[PDB]
């Protein structure tokens, strides 16, 4: 019967769906709300494309002094242009072009040099002449008109260096207040906030040999060329006054100059002296003192000394602090590459902020894009490394050489081809592993509660009991479970590849993934819902366990090197840190731009070894193993219901049976054997043990000794053969709460074992001799006691049963259906062994052919009936053989006092409960810091030897212009041998260069267009727009008409591209490059790193030298002052007039894509410079010149100021905590729904309680309850030393964060313990929607908020302050302001600008405080309002008396009461009019239907009414429900009692909340104790009651403190004879004191013979209302079945 009772069990989970789809939508539609989010986000965001731009040129120091501060003022920014720049072009040199200084100097050269012939005549002594020619030209030219009108610009905008950025580009106290008028202007103060070490700066070097003095001596002569601006100041200082002197008074020379003049405006330039003695004194004047204050500004001392290395560190950790270091270059001493000197060896140390880090010789990943950001990635140039190492260098090429040198240096980027890139997909790839760990919390929460409930309610123990097999259940169990999460990930793949988020990934391998992933989920909650029994304790520890198994994957990711695979692979065996694995490496394969399309199954040989067809593997290999300790521990560790652990049909010999928590056993020791087939009885006082028994004999309970046999067999060990052969019906009923009668029948039959031909005649047969053929399509939840008992007792008879135990068959059960009891009792005798247990004799005596009884655990007798006879009274025998008001504000001081208690004693009993909801999420925490703070130290940054030997093979350039030079070629060879390629022999002159060949296709089509290589000769290549399938441009075979030249040497080849344009071939060349690199896409060996390009050509006119010449002609004349001054600025001038007419250029290309590019090549460059002006010999080994890079030991860490806040480490914590703290304000809920749903709140509520004050204590003690997570949590912040959340400035906003937030949560979570049945279920979603609340929201909005700023920043402000109403996004942004806003600070205080903010602001967390502290109490203002949401001829006689006449005696007076079940057609109750006096006992009988407990409650106040009133003592039921509450007792059907407290508690809290004085509780609790007969069992807890000892204690607390009217329902229900003696002595005392008693019940005595005014009700109508001695005049048992044929 295995695939039948799989059938069975799928069928049956299928109606469940089927019942409640609303269930099955949120499930399935769950996980999908923050994908829906990022795809919402992802279709507003479009990918973007990048066109083809140029970079510029970039000068160095070598190349002279103005091009460099030309370029390092102008090219602050990359701005690079789509058209070509002019640099690129081989003839041209001089990018910035046209502007006002070249300009200037420009024509001043063409003016000196264009009459320096006239002025040596002049000097020499006609010369007016050539002066006023002279002039005529001083005139023509417009560069002096602009000079005046700039430097006439009135002061202002933002200092002196936008008029210098204007000038050079193109379109001391003084000092220091000139910088802070500037720094106003961030965008002025961007230059000075990058240059401010260039101005301070020390240059130290470690030997003090006077060899490095020689060197620092060739270094410091820029420095000492700079200075000549002072000279000159001092000059024009020393020639004003004389000047000044000479023009005054000097009119009689003037006047005859005009006489001996005898062009016309020269001459009329002295006229008037307006436009000649002041203005050009005055703009002369201010231009020296300008830039005398320029040069002032510098210190001019840059150089220093250190005696050795210890001593240079020292003093470079002492001058770090005021900003005063920039070199630390060290001239080490290698004696070594070879003997002899020349083989130095500089090594430069240079702060971390500045430098470039050394970790990594290239990138980490192929970003598509040139990597061209000024401000994070061109470090090397706006830091000062690479002017250092030039002028370093140059200084050491001069000093070892000897000569001087000409070749400066320049610096070219190269194109990057056209681009489209995709920076969503890489934000994403970083958070996709947390968000697809979060999506699946609710199932795996929701199958472990299910999982523990259905084996908690005995449930399973039950269905397993009548013959199902733990493996059926378990396969079952699975398949249901893993249908939804099967759906679920189609739907998700779905949506993922719609949406683009992965779109390469072909569908049908990444569902393979989520379907393993799924697998591994639900065995794994299957395994972690075998620890615990109780629902509670495991809806409490459900989510921590399984979030607490994601983080060893970030401890594995952070600890990412120095792990060997074994430790990955011991560490994968967990889930989540799997499936993190292969969703990385899933992530890496779509952002390389290849896909997954079935093929890429081996692939990934790299640190994520990794691929998707790997970690499935892995995952099934998980399951397997969960599932086998699944298996394992359930065989091993049963639970609380423990199953056993591997013709006298029944017999049990030495059984006895021992609870921990009772000191005394229950049983002591039986010796009781069963028969054949007679029907045996089991009669005993209450407390014997008779059901414990009962459930030993099943396979409830073990027994704690001896044995019990049945059919043979043995219980103990092997039970499996007694399955088959059993019926079980528990005394409390179990049932499926949806399934209807005619399903449960079914259900039962096809399980026990019948075949599906007979199951209608059977069921009909047996559903028609209960008598519940009258109902067959109505769900058990809406049945009644007596129904649901017949119900039991006939699932119990279904099928062929060998042996059937009985548990009180009948209970609240009229004789009617008492009748069909007995016949089916009898029909199945023959040899079925039926087993019976009552209270009732008659029934014994009746059917009992051997009655044994059993009291105190012992077999008092067993024999026939007839033994026994020589019954209630024998039965009796033989068991006794064994056997003023506190009134006013006082009380509400004492209401407290008790209700406060209540709780307390609550915690007392169950500590593992609170241990387990107050205190574990405060050590999740702990533990979460604790896996997120380890880290692998970090030593020093290593040094390298900056050489392009350490990347490998590459290609070079040979670019050549002007050859006809000897230099030129000894340079070129130079750099040729340095490169590698040794010279080749005589045989092998021209034998060089190879040739390759063009392709046929190629050829053709170059033959078709034009061979020229100064026109476009690539063809144009697509553009491609977005599109997704291709990032790079279409490439084609058109580009270069040659194939490059390549000659191979030593591991690098270097090619010749003379002639060619020499701009397009990288454009065209790279995009195949691109593609071609494939296998890795992350260090692909590109194989164009850089090159050179030896321009030639000199960018100065022919007439320069001519200036000198000049020059020279005025040394001669004006006679040269012996001081110098006027000597030394004389031949600084020739030399510059000299060095005018340079040598050469050396352009440099260099590719960013490789880091340490640009410094290798320049150190190359520079040693082939070296080589070449060396002199011929076999010393070329013996000098060569190494660069070195070292950081200073200074411990610091790569700061990234381009990259903010990135979904870090602190976002995790943050995700953490809230994580925790979502789940504490939800343990508030279990006890509010399971008082409310037992009817034991409704009882304190008629003691006498306002609503407001239960609500106010509960308040209380749930805030007394939350502040002891805060305190841990605050301590373990404290211990672990978090600078960022706990520290002496912004603790009081952690404080009133965690505080106010406990203070606001709390009065949220009770309205929500109005509409829930079962607490854990509550308890699960409440926590569910929590966490859902808090992180979906508060981190999507922080994701939203960095990254994409497209005014999705507006869109996030938006957004925020709506997300005020929920007190959960309060704790959520909160928490990450605080950490933003001090990773800001310490920012600020790693850069030095010592700025700290405030942590309470109106903008980071006060608004949030203020809103959720206004918005607190309005949630309980809401609960207490919710609260109150409630605002014959007798009978004909009785309603026309109560219509008409007003009888003031009478205490309780229907009106009409009528209540409809929701539509069930025929109203139950309807239209009953009844008038009761002070002093009568009443009575009610009627039928299971009539709707006795329908009036209870509807008279009672428990439910609001339809039609009609209920007045009880003047004050209305509806209408002031409180005043009617003040004076009642209650006791309903179902009792309500505190499993936990104790039946003295009870009393004591009852007569404490009436408002007895202090001093009488205990007697009144005593007392009442006392007069029921419960004293031996008053002091244990109330839960290990039986029925008889619960029904007794409940009848107890409504008549304690002595109320007007006592509504008892039925009080008899199981009780024994003695106890049924003390209850009606009670209620004769009680209403001969004077109050009256509505008992209802089908029993006699107080009901029927001392009552007295009974009436029967039937389907909701009165029949007679009249005495009983009346009824039996007019008309005991079958009196009242005559009298209900009667009409
Ligand atoms: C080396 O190859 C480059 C190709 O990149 C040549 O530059 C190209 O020069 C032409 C000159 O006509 C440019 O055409 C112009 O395009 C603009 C675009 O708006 C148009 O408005 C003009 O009317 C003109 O057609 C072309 O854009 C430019 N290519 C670029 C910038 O990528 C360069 O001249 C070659 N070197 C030589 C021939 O020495
Ligand atoms: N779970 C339990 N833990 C500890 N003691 C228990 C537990 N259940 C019952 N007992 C105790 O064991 C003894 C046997 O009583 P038991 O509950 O078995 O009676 P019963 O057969 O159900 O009787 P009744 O006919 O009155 O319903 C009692 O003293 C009872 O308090
Ligand atoms: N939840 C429900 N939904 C629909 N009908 C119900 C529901 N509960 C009870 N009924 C029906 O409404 C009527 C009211 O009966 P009620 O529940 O008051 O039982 P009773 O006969 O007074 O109790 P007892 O079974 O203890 O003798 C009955 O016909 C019953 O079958
Ligand atoms: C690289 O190619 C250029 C192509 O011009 C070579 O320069 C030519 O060299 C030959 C032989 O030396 C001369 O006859 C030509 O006159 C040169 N060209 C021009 C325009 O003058 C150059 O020699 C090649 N590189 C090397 C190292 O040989
Ligand atoms: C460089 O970029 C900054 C920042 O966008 C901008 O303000 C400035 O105008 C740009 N150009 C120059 C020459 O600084
Ligand atoms: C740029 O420089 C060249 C160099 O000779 C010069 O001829 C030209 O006038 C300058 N200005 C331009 C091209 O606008
Ligand atoms: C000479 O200087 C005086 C002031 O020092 C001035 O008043 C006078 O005008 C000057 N003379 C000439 C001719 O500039
Ligand atoms: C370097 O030049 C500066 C000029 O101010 C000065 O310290 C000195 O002349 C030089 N120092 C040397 C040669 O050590
Ligand atoms: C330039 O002038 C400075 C002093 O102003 C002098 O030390 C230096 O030697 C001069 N230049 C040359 C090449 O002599
Ligand atoms: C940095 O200084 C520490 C001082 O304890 C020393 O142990 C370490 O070796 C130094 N590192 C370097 C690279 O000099
Ligand atoms: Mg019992
Ligand atoms: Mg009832």
């Given at each position: 019967a295995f695939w039948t009772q799989l059938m069975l069990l799928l069928w049956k989970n299928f109606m469940y769906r089927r019942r409640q789809p609303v269930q099955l939508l949120v499930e399935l539609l769950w996980p999908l709300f923050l994908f829906f989010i990022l795809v919402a986000v992802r279709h507003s965001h479009p990918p973007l494309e990048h066109h083809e731009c140029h970079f510029p040129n970039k000068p160095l120091p070598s190349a002279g002094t103005v091009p460099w501060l030309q370029g390092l003022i102008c090219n602050?920014?990359?701005?690079?242009?789509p058209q070509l720049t002019p640099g690129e072009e081989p003839g041209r040199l001089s990018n910035f072009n046209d502007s006002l200084v070249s300009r200037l100097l420009a024509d001043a050269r063409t003016v000196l040099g264009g009459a320096s012939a006239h002025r040596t005549l002049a000097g020499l002594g006609s010369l007016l002449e050539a002066a006023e020619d002279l002039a005529q030209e001083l005139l023509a030219l417009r560069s002096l008109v602009e000079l005046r009108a700039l430097l006439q610009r009135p002061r202002g905008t933002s200092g002196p260096l936008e008029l210098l950025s204007e000038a050079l580009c193109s379109v001391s106290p003084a000092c220091s207040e000139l910088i802070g008028a500037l720094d106003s202007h961030p965008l002025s103060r961007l230059l000075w906030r990058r240059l401010k070490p260039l101005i301070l700066g020390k240059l130290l070097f470690a030997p003090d040999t006077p060899f490095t003095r020689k060197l620092m001596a060739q270094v410091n002569r820029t420095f000492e060329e700079l200075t000549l601006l002072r000279d000159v100041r001092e000059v024009w200082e020393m020639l004003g006054p004389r000047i000044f002197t000479f023009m005054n008074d000097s009119s009689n020379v003037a006047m005859l100059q005009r006489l001996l003049q005898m062009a016309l405006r020269s001459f009329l330039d002295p006229g008037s002296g307006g436009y000649s003695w002041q203005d050009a004194h005055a703009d002369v004047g201010h231009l020296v003192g300008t830039l005398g204050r320029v040069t002032e500004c510098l210190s001019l001392d840059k150089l220093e000394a250190a005696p050795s290395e210890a001593a240079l560190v020292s003093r470079a950790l002492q001058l770090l602090a005021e900003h005063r270091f920039w070199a630390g270059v060290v001239f080490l001493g290698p004696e070594t590459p070879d003997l002899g000197p020349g083989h130095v060896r500089i090594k430069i140390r240079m702060d971390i902020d500045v430098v470039t880090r050394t970790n990594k010789i290239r990138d980490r990943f192929w970003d598509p894009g040139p990597a061209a950001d000024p401000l994070t990635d061109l470090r090397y140039v706006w830091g000062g490394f690479v002017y250092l190492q030039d002028l370093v260098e140059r200084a050491a090429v001069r000093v070892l050489s000897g000569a001087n040198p000409r070749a400066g240096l320049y610096l070219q980027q190269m194109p990057y081809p056209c681009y489209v890139d995709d920076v969503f997909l890489r934000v994403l790839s970083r958070s996709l592993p947390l968000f697809l760990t979060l999506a699946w919390i609710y199932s795996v929460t929701l199958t472990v509660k299910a999982v523990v409930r259905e084996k908690e309610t005995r449930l399973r123990d039950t269905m397993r009991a009548m013959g199902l097999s733990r493996a059926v259940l378990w396969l079952g169990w699975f398949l249901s479970c893993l249908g939804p999460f099967l759906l679920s990930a189609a739907l998700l793949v779905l949506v993922l590849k719609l949406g683009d988020i992965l779109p390469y990934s072909h569908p049908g391998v990444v569902f393979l993934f989520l379907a393993a992933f799924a697998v591994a989920t639900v065995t794994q909650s299957f395994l972690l819902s075998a620890?615990?029994?109780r629902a509670n304790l495991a809806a409490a520890c459900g989510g921590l366990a399984y979030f607490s198994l994601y983080l060893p994957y970030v401890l594995c990711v952070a600890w990412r090197d120095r792990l060997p695979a074994g430790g990955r692979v011991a560490a994968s065996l967990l889930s989540p840190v799997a499936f993190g694995f292969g969703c990385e490496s899933l992530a890496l394969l779509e952002e390389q731009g290849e896909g997954a399309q079935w093929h890429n199954v081996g692939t990934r040989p790299t640190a994520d070894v990794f691929s998707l067809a790997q970690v499935s593997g892995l995952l099934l290999l998980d399951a397997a193993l969960y599932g086998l300790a699944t298996w394992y521990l359930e065989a091993v560790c049963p639970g609380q219901y423990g199953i056993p652990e591997p013709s006298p049909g029944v017999s049990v010999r030495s059984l006895e049976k021992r609870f921990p928590g009772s000191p005394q056993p229950a049983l002591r020791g039986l010796s009781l054997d069963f028969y054949q087939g007679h029907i045996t009885a089991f009669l005993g006082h209450n407390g014997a043990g008779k059901t414990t028994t009962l459930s030993i004999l099943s396979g409830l309970f073990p027994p704690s000794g001896g044995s019990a046999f049945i059919l043979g067999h043995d219980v103990r060990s092997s039970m499996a053969a007694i399955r088959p052969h059993l019926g079980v019906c528990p005394q409390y009923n179990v049932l499926f709460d949806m399934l209807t009668v005619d399903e449960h029948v079914w259900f039962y039959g096809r399980l026990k074992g019948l075949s599906a031909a007979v199951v209608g005649p059977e069921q009909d047969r047996l559903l028609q001799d209960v008598g519940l053929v009258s109902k067959q399509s109505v769900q058990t939840r809406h049945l009644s006691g007596g129904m649901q008992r017949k119900l039991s007792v006939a699932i119990a008879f279904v099928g062929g049963s060998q042996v059937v135990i009985l548990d009180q068959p009948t209970a609240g059960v009229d004789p009617a259906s008492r009748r069909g009891i007995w016949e089916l009792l009898l029909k199945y005798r023959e040899g079925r062994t039926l087993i019976l247990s009552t209270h009732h004799l008659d029934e014994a005596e009746l059917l009992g052919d051997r009655v044994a009884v059993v009291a105190g655990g012992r077999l008092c007798c067993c024999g026939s009936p007839l033994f026994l006879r020589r019954l209630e009274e024998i039965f009796l025998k033989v068991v006794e053989e064994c056997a003023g008001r506190v009134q006013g504000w006082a009380l509400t001081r004492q209401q407290l006092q008790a209700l406060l208690l209540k709780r307390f004693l609550l915690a007392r009993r169950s500590r593992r409960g609170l241990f387990a909801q107050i205190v574990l999420p405060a050590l999740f925490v702990g533990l979460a810091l604790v896996f997120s703070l380890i880290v692998p130290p970090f030593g020093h940054y290593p040094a390298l030897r900056l050489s392009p030997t350490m990347y490998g093979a590459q290609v070079s350039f040979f670019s050549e212009d002007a050859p006809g030079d000897p230099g030129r070629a000894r340079l070129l060879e130079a750099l040729l041998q340095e490169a590698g390629l040794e010279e080749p022999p005589v045989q092998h002159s021209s034998h060089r260069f190879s040739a390759p060949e063009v392709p046929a296709e190629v050829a053709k089509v170059l033959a078709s267009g034009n061979w020229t290589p100064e026109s476009p000769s690539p063809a144009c290549q697509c553009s491609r727009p977005g599109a997704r399938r291709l990032l790079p441009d279409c490439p084609a075979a058109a580009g270069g008409p040659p194939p490059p030249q390549a000659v191979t040497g030593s591991g690098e080849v270097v090619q010749n591209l003379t002639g060619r344009n020499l701009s397009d071939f990288l454009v065209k060349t790279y995009p195949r490059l691109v593609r071609q690199?494939?296998?890795?896409?992350?260090?692909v060996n590109e194989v164009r790193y850089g090159g050179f390009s030896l321009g030639g050509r000199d960018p100065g006119l022919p007439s320069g030298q001519e200036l000198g010449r000049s020059v020279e002609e005025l040394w001669a004349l004006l006679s040269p002052l012996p001081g110098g001054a006027l000597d030394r600025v004389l031949k600084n001038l020739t030399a510059w007039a000299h060095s005018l007419d340079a040598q050469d250029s050396l352009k440099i290309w260099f590719n960013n894509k490789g880091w340490h590019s640009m410094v290798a090549f320049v150190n190359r460059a520079s040693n082939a410079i070296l080589r070449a002006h060396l002199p011929p010999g076999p010393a070329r080994h013996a000098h060569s010149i190494t660069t070195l890079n070292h950081p200073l030991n200074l411990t610091k860490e790569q700061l990234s100021e381009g990259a903010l806040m990135a979904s870090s480490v602190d976002v995790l914590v943050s995700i953490c905590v809230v994580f925790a703290m979502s789940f504490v304000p939800a343990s508030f809920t279990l006890v509010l729904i399971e008082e409310r749903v037992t009817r034991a709140k409704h009882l304190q509520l008629m003691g006498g309680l306002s609503p407001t004050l239960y609500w106010l204590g509960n308040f209380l003690w749930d805030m007394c309850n939350y502040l002891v997570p805060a305190c841990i949590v605050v301590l373990i912040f404290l211990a672990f030393q978090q600078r960022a959340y706990v520290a002496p400035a912004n603790l009081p906003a952690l404080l009133l964060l965690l505080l106010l937030y406990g203070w606001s949560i709390t009065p949220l979570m009770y309205p929500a313990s109005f509409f829930f049945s079962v607490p854990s279920t509550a308890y699960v979603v409440l926590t569910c929607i929590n966490l859902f609340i808090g992180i979906n929201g508060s981190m999507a909005t922080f994701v939203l908020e960095l990254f994409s700023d497209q005014k999705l920043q507006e869109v996030s402000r938006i957004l925020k302050q709506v997300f005020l109403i929920f007190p959960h996004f309060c704790l959520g942004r909160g928490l990450i302001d605080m950490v933003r806003n001090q990773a800001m600070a310490d920012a600020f205080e790693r850069l030095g600008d010592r700025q700290f903010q405030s942590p309470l602001r109106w903008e980071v967390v006060g608004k949030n405080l203020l809103a959720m502290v206004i918005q607190g109490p309005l949630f309980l203002l809401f609960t207490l309002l919710l609260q109150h949401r409630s605002q014959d001829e007798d009978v004909a006689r009785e309603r026309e008396r109560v219509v008409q006449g007003a009888?003031?005696?009478?205490?309780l007076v229907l009106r009409n009461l009528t209540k409809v079940?929701?539509?069930?057609?025929?109203?139950?109750?309807?239209?009953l009019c009844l008038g009761i006096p002070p002093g009568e006992c009443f009575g009610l009988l009627g039928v299971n239907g009539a709707g006795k407990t329908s009036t209870f409650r509807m008279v009672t106040g428990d439910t609001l009414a339809s039609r009609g009133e209920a007045v009880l003592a003047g004050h209305s039921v509806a209408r002031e429900p409180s005043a009617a509450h003040l004076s009642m007792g209650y006791c309903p059907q179902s009792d309500a009692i505190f499993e936990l407290l104790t039946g003295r508690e009870h009393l004591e809290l009852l007569a404490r909340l009436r408002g007895v004085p202090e001093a009488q509780v205990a007697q009144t609790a005593g007392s009442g104790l006392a007069r029921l007969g419960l004293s031996w069992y008053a002091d244990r807890p109330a839960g290990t009651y039986s029925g008889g000892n619960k029904r007794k204690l409940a009848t107890a607390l409504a008549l304690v403190g002595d109320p007007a009217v006592v509504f008892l329902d039925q009080p008899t229900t199981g009780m024994d004879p003695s106890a049924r003696r003390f209850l009606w002595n009670s209620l004769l005392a009680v209403v001969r004191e004077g109050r009256s008693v509505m008992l209802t019940s089908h029993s006699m005595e107080e009901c029927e013979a001392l009552c007295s005014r009974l009436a029967i009700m039937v389907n909701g109508r009165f029949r007679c209302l009249g005495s009983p001695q009346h009824l039996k005049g007019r008309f005991l048992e079958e009196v009242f079945l005559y009298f209900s044929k009667d009409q």
């Open positions: 602050v920014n990359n701005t690079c242009f620890f615990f029994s690199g494939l296998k890795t896409k992350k260090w009888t003031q005696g009478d205490v079940y929701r539509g069930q057609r025929m109203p139950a109750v309807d239209r």
